[PDB]
Design an enzyme around this catalytic site. Structure first.
Site, PDB file in Angstrom:
ATOM      1  N   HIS A 134      44.941 -31.420  23.783  1.00 12.92           N
ATOM      2  CA  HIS A 134      44.670 -32.369  22.737  1.00 12.92           C
ATOM      3  C   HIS A 134      43.180 -32.664  22.674  1.00 12.92           C
ATOM      4  O   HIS A 134      42.378 -32.011  23.350  1.00 12.92           O
ATOM      5  CB  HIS A 134      45.482 -33.637  22.943  1.00 12.92           C
ATOM      6  CG  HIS A 134      45.240 -34.302  24.263  1.00 12.92           C
ATOM      7  ND1 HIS A 134      45.585 -33.720  25.467  1.00 12.92           N
ATOM      8  CD2 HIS A 134      44.695 -35.503  24.564  1.00 12.92           C
ATOM      9  CE1 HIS A 134      45.266 -34.538  26.452  1.00 12.92           C
ATOM     10  NE2 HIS A 134      44.726 -35.628  25.931  1.00 12.92           N
TER      11      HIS A 134
ATOM     12  N   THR B  25      39.864 -30.660  18.771  1.00 12.79           N
ATOM     13  CA  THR B  25      39.098 -29.425  18.677  1.00 12.79           C
ATOM     14  C   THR B  25      38.787 -28.681  19.969  1.00 12.79           C
ATOM     15  O   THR B  25      38.723 -29.266  21.055  1.00 12.79           O
ATOM     16  CB  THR B  25      37.784 -29.727  18.013  1.00 12.79           C
ATOM     17  OG1 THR B  25      37.184 -30.823  18.708  1.00 12.79           O
ATOM     18  CG2 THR B  25      38.014 -30.119  16.538  1.00 12.79           C
ATOM     19  N   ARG B  26      38.559 -27.383  19.817  1.00 10.53           N
ATOM     20  CA  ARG B  26      38.245 -26.509  20.938  1.00 10.53           C
ATOM     21  C   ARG B  26      37.241 -25.475  20.476  1.00 10.53           C
ATOM     22  O   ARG B  26      37.345 -24.935  19.378  1.00 10.53           O
ATOM     23  CB  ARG B  26      39.505 -25.792  21.428  1.00 10.53           C
ATOM     24  CG  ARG B  26      40.551 -26.716  22.045  1.00 10.53           C
ATOM     25  CD  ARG B  26      40.130 -27.064  23.461  1.00 10.53           C
ATOM     26  NE  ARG B  26      41.074 -27.868  24.237  1.00 10.53           N
ATOM     27  CZ  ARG B  26      41.290 -29.171  24.068  1.00 10.53           C
ATOM     28  NH1 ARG B  26      40.641 -29.852  23.127  1.00 10.53           N
ATOM     29  NH2 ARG B  26      42.126 -29.807  24.884  1.00 10.53           N
TER      30      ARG B  26
ATOM     31  N   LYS C 241      31.510 -34.969  18.752  1.00  8.61           N
ATOM     32  CA  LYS C 241      32.345 -35.107  19.936  1.00  8.61           C
ATOM     33  C   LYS C 241      31.632 -34.435  21.104  1.00  8.61           C
ATOM     34  O   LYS C 241      31.020 -33.368  20.930  1.00  8.61           O
ATOM     35  CB  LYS C 241      33.718 -34.450  19.688  1.00  8.61           C
ATOM     36  CG  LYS C 241      34.550 -34.233  20.938  1.00  8.61           C
ATOM     37  CD  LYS C 241      35.912 -33.649  20.596  1.00  8.61           C
ATOM     38  CE  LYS C 241      36.446 -32.854  21.783  1.00  8.61           C
ATOM     39  NZ  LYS C 241      37.571 -31.959  21.403  1.00  8.61           N
TER      40      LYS C 241
ATOM     41  N   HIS D 269      31.233 -30.955  31.140  1.00  7.91           N
ATOM     42  CA  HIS D 269      32.067 -29.878  31.683  1.00  7.91           C
ATOM     43  C   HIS D 269      32.141 -29.659  33.200  1.00  7.91           C
ATOM     44  O   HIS D 269      33.205 -29.370  33.737  1.00  7.91           O
ATOM     45  CB  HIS D 269      31.628 -28.573  31.012  1.00  7.91           C
ATOM     46  CG  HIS D 269      32.523 -27.396  31.268  1.00  7.91           C
ATOM     47  ND1 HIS D 269      33.863 -27.384  30.923  1.00  7.91           N
ATOM     48  CD2 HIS D 269      32.236 -26.141  31.692  1.00  7.91           C
ATOM     49  CE1 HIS D 269      34.356 -26.172  31.110  1.00  7.91           C
ATOM     50  NE2 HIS D 269      33.391 -25.397  31.578  1.00  7.91           N
TER      51      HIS D 269
ATOM     52  N   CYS E  41      41.808 -35.594  29.236  1.00  9.31           N
ATOM     53  CA  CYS E  41      42.570 -34.385  29.310  1.00  9.31           C
ATOM     54  C   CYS E  41      42.355 -33.669  30.655  1.00  9.31           C
ATOM     55  O   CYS E  41      41.559 -34.130  31.481  1.00  9.31           O
ATOM     56  CB  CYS E  41      42.209 -33.604  28.038  1.00  9.31           C
ATOM     57  SG  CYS E  41      42.287 -31.800  28.013  1.00  9.31           S
TER      58      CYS E  41
ATOM     59  N   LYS F 157      40.555 -21.081  23.821  1.00  8.73           N
ATOM     60  CA  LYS F 157      40.068 -20.080  22.882  1.00  8.73           C
ATOM     61  C   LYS F 157      40.784 -18.742  23.048  1.00  8.73           C
ATOM     62  O   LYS F 157      40.868 -17.967  22.099  1.00  8.73           O
ATOM     63  CB  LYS F 157      38.551 -19.848  23.057  1.00  8.73           C
ATOM     64  CG  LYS F 157      38.172 -19.150  24.389  1.00  8.73           C
ATOM     65  CD  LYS F 157      36.667 -19.005  24.536  1.00  8.73           C
ATOM     66  CE  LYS F 157      35.948 -20.379  24.607  1.00  8.73           C
ATOM     67  NZ  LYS F 157      36.194 -21.092  25.920  1.00  8.73           N
TER      68      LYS F 157
HETATM   69  C1  LIG Z   1      40.970 -30.721  28.754  1.00  8.94           C
HETATM   70  C2  LIG Z   1      39.966 -30.005  28.067  1.00  8.94           C
HETATM   71  C3  LIG Z   1      40.166 -28.662  28.056  1.00  8.94           C
HETATM   72  C4  LIG Z   1      39.364 -27.830  27.267  1.00  8.94           C
HETATM   73  C5  LIG Z   1      38.335 -28.426  26.442  1.00  8.94           C
HETATM   74  C6  LIG Z   1      38.106 -29.857  26.475  1.00  8.94           C
HETATM   75  C7  LIG Z   1      38.907 -30.662  27.298  1.00  8.94           C
HETATM   76  C8  LIG Z   1      38.677 -32.152  27.353  1.00  8.94           C
HETATM   77  N1  LIG Z   1      37.567 -27.704  25.578  1.00  8.94           N
HETATM   78  C9  LIG Z   1      37.843 -26.351  25.538  1.00  8.94           C
HETATM   79  C10 LIG Z   1      37.087 -25.633  24.596  1.00  8.94           C
HETATM   80  O1  LIG Z   1      36.240 -26.133  23.835  1.00  8.94           O
HETATM   81  N2  LIG Z   1      37.360 -24.238  24.533  1.00  8.94           N
HETATM   82  C11 LIG Z   1      38.285 -23.543  25.310  1.00  8.94           C
HETATM   83  O2  LIG Z   1      38.452 -22.363  25.176  1.00  8.94           O
HETATM   84  N3  LIG Z   1      38.992 -24.294  26.212  1.00  8.94           N
HETATM   85  C12 LIG Z   1      38.771 -25.627  26.307  1.00  8.94           C
HETATM   86  N4  LIG Z   1      39.548 -26.385  27.204  1.00  8.94           N
HETATM   87  C13 LIG Z   1      40.497 -25.604  28.151  1.00  8.94           C
HETATM   88  C14 LIG Z   1      41.840 -25.346  27.475  1.00  8.94           C
HETATM   89  O3  LIG Z   1      42.218 -26.552  26.706  1.00  8.94           O
HETATM   90  C15 LIG Z   1      42.837 -25.152  28.654  1.00  8.94           C
HETATM   91  O4  LIG Z   1      42.490 -24.038  29.433  1.00  8.94           O
HETATM   92  C16 LIG Z   1      44.327 -24.889  27.926  1.00  8.94           C
HETATM   93  O5  LIG Z   1      44.728 -25.882  27.099  1.00  8.94           O
HETATM   94  C17 LIG Z   1      45.199 -24.469  29.044  1.00  8.94           C
HETATM   95  O6  LIG Z   1      46.538 -24.235  28.415  1.00  8.94           O
HETATM   96  P1  LIG Z   1      47.915 -24.244  29.242  1.00  8.94           P
HETATM   97  O7  LIG Z   1      48.937 -23.715  28.367  1.00  8.94           O
HETATM   98  O8  LIG Z   1      47.651 -23.816  30.615  1.00  8.94           O
HETATM   99  O9  LIG Z   1      48.106 -25.909  29.472  1.00  8.94           O
HETATM  100  P2  LIG Z   1      48.859 -26.954  28.366  1.00  8.94           P
HETATM  101  O10 LIG Z   1      48.342 -26.689  27.018  1.00  8.94           O
HETATM  102  O11 LIG Z   1      48.651 -28.254  29.074  1.00  8.94           O
HETATM  103  O12 LIG Z   1      50.321 -26.518  28.481  1.00  8.94           O
HETATM  104  C18 LIG Z   1      51.154 -26.679  29.683  1.00  8.94           C
HETATM  105  C19 LIG Z   1      52.450 -27.222  29.207  1.00  8.94           C
HETATM  106  O13 LIG Z   1      53.469 -27.105  30.188  1.00  8.94           O
HETATM  107  C20 LIG Z   1      54.245 -28.265  30.267  1.00  8.94           C
HETATM  108  N5  LIG Z   1      54.906 -28.567  31.489  1.00  8.94           N
HETATM  109  C21 LIG Z   1      54.325 -29.044  32.626  1.00  8.94           C
HETATM  110  N6  LIG Z   1      55.164 -29.183  33.616  1.00  8.94           N
HETATM  111  C22 LIG Z   1      56.372 -28.774  33.107  1.00  8.94           C
HETATM  112  C23 LIG Z   1      57.692 -28.677  33.651  1.00  8.94           C
HETATM  113  N7  LIG Z   1      57.964 -29.014  34.926  1.00  8.94           N
HETATM  114  N8  LIG Z   1      58.712 -28.221  32.862  1.00  8.94           N
HETATM  115  C24 LIG Z   1      58.440 -27.880  31.575  1.00  8.94           C
HETATM  116  N9  LIG Z   1      57.208 -27.941  30.975  1.00  8.94           N
HETATM  117  C25 LIG Z   1      56.222 -28.404  31.811  1.00  8.94           C
HETATM  118  C26 LIG Z   1      53.421 -29.416  29.615  1.00  8.94           C
HETATM  119  O14 LIG Z   1      54.173 -30.481  29.037  1.00  8.94           O
HETATM  120  C27 LIG Z   1      52.445 -28.683  28.717  1.00  8.94           C
HETATM  121  O15 LIG Z   1      52.898 -28.792  27.385  1.00  8.94           O
END
Ligand SMILES: *Cc1cc2c(cc1C)nc1c(=O)[nH]c(=O)nc-1n2C[C@H](O)[C@H](O)[C@H](O)COP(=O)(O)OP(=O)(O)OC[C@H]1O[C@@H](n2cnc3c(N)ncnc32)[C@H](O)[C@@H]1O
Ligand SMILES: [Cl-]
Length: 385
Positions: A45, A48-49, A265, A269, A315, A348
């Site tokens: 969330h 933007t990314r 924003k 990092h 996040c 990304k």
């Molecule tokens: C946090 C952050 C990250 C970030 C960024 C700025 C911030 C503040 N800016 C970025 C940017 O400009 N460019 C870029 O390329 N990356 C940037 N990032 C990193 C990127 O957001 C992270 O690497 C990415 O979002 C990682 O994705 P992933 O798929 O690993 O993580 P998620 O989106 O959180 O999804 C995980 C999901 O799994 C679920 N979950 C967790 N535990 C369970 C269990 N037990 N059972 C079922 N589901 C589960 C979560 O609910 C979640 O939805």
């Protein structure tokens, strides 16, 4: 009594992309998530990314970045949700004092990427609103940009569901049962079986991979961002203020131009609090550093974008020891795919990664070179119980 071809546990950035790739191929897929993606509890969330092609973290990521870029353009055409805006991305730092800037420059040359090189006052001249010292240099990538991350996941989900993928929300997977020819997951809402399993739980990979007999160092970090009232005549996407990721003496910062007056924003990092995904404090501002580390940067480098705090978000990053991702088959189970440790820079690539995960689940292999993300690499310090 409902078997699936493939079960994706964790339907976030990587999982939803994979579910979309699978569903598009008529593969009966079940995606399970602890919440309802897109949400504000994971790592996607904050609206933007940034997506960059010339990659400072390492030139070896360029192929996957270029492929992900083509996939985002495809996504834009398939949904009514906004996916990408070509803001261009500016990377700068003190001359001769940034491995990040230097590798970005090398990555661009090695892959013949289109970029502009400039330094000192040329940076401040080209973009009113940026004030760097004269000893700073930069590399600007005009064709890179900004992704609307929540929209991306929402689009992938809507499209995957339209094709038959099922998404079970607010369901936390608590344990796994893997056999040579099938996989099974356990949740408070019931258990499910499939032929293949994709594990992409983001920050929770650090707490639950042990349930798959894996012991890999993964550290979640609390990473905040803030939106600040800005001089719109300078920092608006409309006047071509770029997205950016830069290196200063005290670390790396990244930011986005103001979109529709939302305010520039920014995020710090290289620093964040070590936390646990189930006890992290998700309120922005509870630590004095949340807002002060950001203004410390703004007052020095983007002074006209240091007004009232309009919004904050909290996040998580999940880092591996070498800060490179993990995308590979489970060393003991060829029917389990793992996607973890995106170390704060994986969104990304999520489109490209979903394609990779789909290929690994269906064929046990991928057409992409993912050796740098091997789960067996030494720098990772991986193990089994
Ligand atoms: C946090 C952050 C990250 C970030 C960024 C700025 C911030 C503040 N800016 C970025 C940017 O400009 N460019 C870029 O390329 N990356 C940037 N990032 C990193 C990127 O957001 C992270 O690497 C990415 O979002 C990682 O994705 P992933 O798929 O690993 O993580 P998620 O989106 O959180 O999804 C995980 C999901 O799994 C679920 N979950 C967790 N535990 C369970 C269990 N037990 N059972 C079922 N589901 C589960 C979560 O609910 C979640 O939805
Ligand atoms: Cl991450």
């Amino acid at each position: 009594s409902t078997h699936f071809d493939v079960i994706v546990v964790g339907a976030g950035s990587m999982g939803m992309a994979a579910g979309y790739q699978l569903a598009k191929q008529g593969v009966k897929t079940l995606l399970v998530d602890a919440f309802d993606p897109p949400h504000t509890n994971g790592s996607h969330h904050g609206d933007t990314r940034i997506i960059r092609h010339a990659y400072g973290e390492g030139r070896e990521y360029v192929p996957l970045a270029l492929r992900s870029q083509e996939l985002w353009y495809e996504l834009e055409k398939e949904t009514h949700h906004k996916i990408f805006t070509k803001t261009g991305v500016l990377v700068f730092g003190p001359k001769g004092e940034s491995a990040f800037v230097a590798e970005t420059m090398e990555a661009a040359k090695e892959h013949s990427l289109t970029v502009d090189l400039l330094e000192g006052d040329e940076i401040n001249k080209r973009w009113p609103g940026i004030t760097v010292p004269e000893n700073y240099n930069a590399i600007f990538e005009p064709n890179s940009g900004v992704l609307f991350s929540e929209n991306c996941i929402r689009a992938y989900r809507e499209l995957a569901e339209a094709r038959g993928a099922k998404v079970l929300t607010h369901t936390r997977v608590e344990d796994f049962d893997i056999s040579p020819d099938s996989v099974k997951i356990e949740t408070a809402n019931g258990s499910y079986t499939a032929d293949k399993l994709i594990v992409s739980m983001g920050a929770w990979n650090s707490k639950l991979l042990s349930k798959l007999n894996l012991d890999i160092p993964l550290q979640p970090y609390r990473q905040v961002v803030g939106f600040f009232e800005s001089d719109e005549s300078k920092y608006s996407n409309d006047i071509d203020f770029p997205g950016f990721m830069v290196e200063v003496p005290n670390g790396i910062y990244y930011g986005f131009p103001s979109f529709g007056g939302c305010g520039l924003k920014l995020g710090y990092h290289t620093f964040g609090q070590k936390i646990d995904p189930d006890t992290i404090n998700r309120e922005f501002g509870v630590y004095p550093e949340d807002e002060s580390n950001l203004r410390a940067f703004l007052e020095e480098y983007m002074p006209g974008a240091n007004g009232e705090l309009k919004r904050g978000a909290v996040c998580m990053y999940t880092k591996t020891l070498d800060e490179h991702f993990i995308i590979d088959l489970h060393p003991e189970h060829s029917n389990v795919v793992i996607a973890a440790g995106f170390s704060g820079h994986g969104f990304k690539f999520s489109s490209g990664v979903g394609e990779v995960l789909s290929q690994l689940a269906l064929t046990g292999k991928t057409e992409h070179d993912i050796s740098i993300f091997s789960i067996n690499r030494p720098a990772l310090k991986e193990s089994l119980q």
